[PDB]
Amino acid sequence: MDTSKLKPNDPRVKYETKQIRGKTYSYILGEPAGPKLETVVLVHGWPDMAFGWRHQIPYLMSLGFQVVAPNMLGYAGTDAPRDLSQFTLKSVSADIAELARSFVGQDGQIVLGGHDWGGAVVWRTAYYHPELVKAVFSVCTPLHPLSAEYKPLEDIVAAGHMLNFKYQLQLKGPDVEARIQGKDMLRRFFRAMFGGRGPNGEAGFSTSDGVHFDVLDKIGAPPLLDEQELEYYVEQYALQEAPELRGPLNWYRTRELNAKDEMDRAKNGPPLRFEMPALFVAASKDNALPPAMSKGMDAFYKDLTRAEVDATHWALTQAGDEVNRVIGEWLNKALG
């Protein structure tokens, strides 16, 4: 079959929805070449969508995998509930668990892949539902411990800590949600998020201040999306009701809710312990999730495979062929 990356509305895959835990969940479904080895569920992050796995979906299909890549909660054709507790890692993990079992049955198992916020989802999903996750990998996103304590992010960065996360203050606030509405602003927003630059090298986004609205006017062609792919992101993000980015930005408004769930797990529940085979693909030039952030991550895993790729945060695409290689070979050993 054709293993080249998915094009917008590629006919090699199917585009379906299912009711999942009260929400409409849109997803990409790719059927395997040959008898199904495993079902692989891929979870994207912010500000991405299922199409963000366009390099991995046809590749994993050609390896004999069924591939389910949902548009996560708040993105594209998937519902964006008003309630913030729907956006916790626990609830979203339960969404992935019910969606995965809608294909492999309640007794079945899956391979689970995540990137950015999706990588955090799949670690938590492997933690909450070990019966389901036969193998799990995450690109860029390392494991983070069960929250033992809640502190406002303002106070954390005010003390000089977690400075690589200070962009989240703007994202969770009203500025990005109010100003990035309609396709015209979405097109500039995506040009900024995927590497576009201004006449004097102005970046449209930074990990310190977030979106630079002052710059989106002069933001140029992004090096990491072609014109067809950029228009697809705009079209799919336009499927959300205005303000279109409320759903995606809701993922940055759940620090306290996630803290309340995991402060319970830290006290009573089982520890962060991964017995199934695991892979972590770090990205060298990811300024949001730097490789050094994964320092003592190996201690939580019985079987963690480490790899690192010289790429930006957008390693699934910028280094799609290399990421495909790391996944396929690790998957080949992890499954036998």
Ligand SMILES: CNC(=O)c1ccc(O[C@H]2CC[C@H](NC(=O)Nc3ccc(OC(F)(F)F)cc3)CC2)cc1
């Ligand atoms: C030791 N581990 C920890 O402390 C820890 C790890 C993960 C975690 O959850 C993370 C939070 C961040 C979220 N992703 C995100 O914000 N991505 C993002 C950023 C910036 C962008 O713009 C860019 F600059 F990249 F172009 C585009 C996407 C993933 C899960 C919490 C704690």
